[PDB]
Point group: C3
Chain length 317, copies 3
Amino acid sequence: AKSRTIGIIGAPFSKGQPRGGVEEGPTVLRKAGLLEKLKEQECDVKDYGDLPFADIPNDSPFQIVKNPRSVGKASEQLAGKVAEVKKNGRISLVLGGDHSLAIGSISGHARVHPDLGVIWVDAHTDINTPLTTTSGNLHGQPVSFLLKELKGKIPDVPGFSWVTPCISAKDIVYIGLRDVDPGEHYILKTLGIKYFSMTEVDRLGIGKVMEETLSYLLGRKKRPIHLSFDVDGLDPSFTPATGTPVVGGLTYREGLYITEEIYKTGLLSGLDIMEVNPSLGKTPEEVTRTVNTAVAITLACFGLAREGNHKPIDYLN
Amino acid sequence: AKSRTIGIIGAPFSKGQPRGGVEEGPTVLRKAGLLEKLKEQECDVKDYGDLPFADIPNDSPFQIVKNPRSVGKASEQLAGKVAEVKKNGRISLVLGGDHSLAIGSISGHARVHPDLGVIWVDAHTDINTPLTTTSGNLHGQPVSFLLKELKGKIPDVPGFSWVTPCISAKDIVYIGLRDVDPGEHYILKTLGIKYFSMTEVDRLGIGKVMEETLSYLLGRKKRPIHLSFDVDGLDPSFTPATGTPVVGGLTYREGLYITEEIYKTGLLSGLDIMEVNPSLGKTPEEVTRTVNTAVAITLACFGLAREGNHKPIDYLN
Amino acid sequence: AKSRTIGIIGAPFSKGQPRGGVEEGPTVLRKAGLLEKLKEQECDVKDYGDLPFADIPNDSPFQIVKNPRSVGKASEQLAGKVAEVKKNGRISLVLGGDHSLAIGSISGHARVHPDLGVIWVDAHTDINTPLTTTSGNLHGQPVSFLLKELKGKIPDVPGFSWVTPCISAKDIVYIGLRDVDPGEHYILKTLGIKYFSMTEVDRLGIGKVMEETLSYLLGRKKRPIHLSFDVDGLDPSFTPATGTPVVGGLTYREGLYITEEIYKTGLLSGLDIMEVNPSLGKTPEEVTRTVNTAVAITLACFGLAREGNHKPIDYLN
Ligand SMILES: O=C(O)[C@H]1NC[C@@H]2NCC[C@@]21CCC[B-](O)(O)O
Ligand SMILES: O=C(O)[C@H]1NC[C@@H]2NCC[C@@]21CCC[B-](O)(O)O
Ligand SMILES: O=C(O)[C@H]1NC[C@@H]2NCC[C@@]21CCC[B-](O)(O)O
Ligand SMILES: [Mn+2]
Ligand SMILES: [Mn+2]
Ligand SMILES: [Mn+2]
Ligand SMILES: [Mn+2]
Ligand SMILES: [Mn+2]
Ligand SMILES: [Mn+2]
């Protein structure tokens, strides 16, 4: 089935942020037996491997923005590969790696599917511009590089001249926000982006959050969905091995429900499993928990249901 | 009062599953002060003691089905004891023991009240037949032996000739589901059994889940309610000392809300507190925590409300 | 802005209960940088200091009621300081200290704002009278001294001759109740007090609770709100360093949702942060977890929003 025909892309990249180890995210997710569990779930899995991100020495900052050429090239490479995987009729599954890679993941997906709608699962908006950012970390900036409305607000940053904004403010829904910088809150509110902070999740429950999310994106007509999942969108009690954890996150149950509802639409075309840093758990158990949750999240994206699952055969015969 | 009149049955049995210690559940629950706690709560409590489950050595498997004669005989003796407790005008409170004892508990209860409805609180459906089972552990099959619609699909298993299916597929509601086998999922779907998996709980909220459950079982006519509570129904952060734990469970609050709602009907007639295994904690606190949660669930079944309770007297005098 | 204009009152008092350390509550909340954090989110902050509570030797009990003169004088002192702050056109922020100080806090507030409405966030009703109490601890009795409808039910207790009942049973809403004594539950029913115990929060969701809480108090017209927040209203997994902890409490999210909703009305006029006891942590991390949670709740009462916050300028310039 289309909703179970997958292409795996490893993105061992970390230079989009300061904490080392997120480049081991595809490695630890593969070792956890992701490809195997997907095949046991009636999925047609093709592995495209891990992208070779060659080192860029003398990659001086653009103002305060660190490693621009490295980030820009990594996303340039991932775009080409996501566009490749999408042309072959497969759902692209990107194993991160820091959230800056979403520039390439969405741009590559948009090349083949321009009418795509984004669902962004994160504690963060990641919408800072190279001028609004105070950190200079490009994993907190991918959405600003992708929005057509922020054209003219993004300066010519080294390594990003290949970029062409591919999504409008209207094409994205955020779920799980709880750590939004003031510039980002200004962008979020002035551009009129649809969002569900933890406040909206609390008020409505995840049930109506999904009803409202999917209706907003798929009301007009059926269109491709790109889910960019940052594991820090979930509470640190489920994904502690992450770069920027924030308390009061989405439960494991909510995370499963979101991915379960997206599967049921049959419109998943792109998936990002981002910010798994296996060198950041306090105990070895913390690392396995994060990886186990990220694996559980991905399987739900491709059919695994909590009510059970069966093949089209009579089990009583 | 009828909703607070109780007959306690200790069912120290473990041969429905592979892990030793579930037979100590009735000891630990008593040791925790369950009898004293119910009497503080204005309950009329009679202790019927623990059932002697005399050794049945030479009980070789029926196909892949382990200990069939021991499991069947225990459920047959339990049925007889539940029927006697029911004849004494008391609510049978069976302290398990593995969940295979539900064959006996429900058969013996349906003997006195054939019009009963079942609420099954568990992470699992326990609806595998001796032919769909992969484990061959009978605690994962009790419901198949009880359903009228499965008559013809149950082989002639030694120790089970006394069993006549006593409930229709329409007289059962599952709450808590998150680990369902393929064969079980086929049965659940084709028989049209009402269930609220962790997906429905997430979607609706425990509030609507309880409203639908009580309307579905009592809307047509008021009838006795048999609640079969498997402690693995709750999240392993509340009930860790159990045989088959599954993440993303029902919360402590959700557990108490289910039971407070059942108490308020005044129609609870049978209760099963199953799968407590005091040998299965990672620490001695994990054990006390499971017993404490189980005790708390039991108290809510017999009137203990979080808003408070008071006797019919003038407290300001 | 009125909603962000604060008068800080430290109340290091513990004699309303038998556990040492609750007097260090103002100290640890200040140490964690509360004032600095409020100033950072555009609040006008005046520090009225930590009140000096003179020792009362020969403070003989009233029947079973412990330290009546000490608790009575501490509240009488706090009433004077709260009324002074209210007369300055500032919202009073009381850093406790046990909950018996709510006698002084609400009394002092009602002196300047007789039309006030109270939101009581607790695991407890704290409505026992000096005659219904079984512990004799005054922190479990403040509401009884404040309620107009309990005039004639409260005897002449030394230290409380200055008290005038200032709120009607119709002017208070409880949130989070799960440990209510018989006498308290009886007072709740005979006086027709509006409450949302954990049972109602479970049935309705924190969204409906807040819609209903605000419309019950403000339906007729706008009126000042006094939020009395006991940290034990929240689950011991978020606030463990407290004297009387009860399992199955409000989540970290629910706590913020309540306080974010109260900020939005712009009617917050009085606030108490009660029962933080830093000497009741099992580990130093338990203490920092209670304090950080208590700070998070306080900041949400004065504008900090999970969706984000921005100054009234152009960030894209
Ligand atoms: O621009 C920034 O660096 C910051 N702005 C809000 C967040 N707060 C901490 C870091 C952060 C980015 C999260 C990036 B992440 O991939 O983890 O979602
Ligand atoms: O038939 C089986 O063995 C399995 N079918 C689903 C469950 N998954 C693990 C074991 C299991 C039984 C749970 C039994 B219990 O009492 O814990 O619900
Ligand atoms: O009057 C009493 O002592 C008791 N009545 C119900 C409660 N349960 C134990 C203590 C308690 C009051 C908590 C006071 B507190 O401030 O923590 O809410
Ligand atoms: Mn992100
Ligand atoms: Mn993030
Ligand atoms: Mn079971
Ligand atoms: Mn189970
Ligand atoms: Mn209190
Ligand atoms: Mn309290």
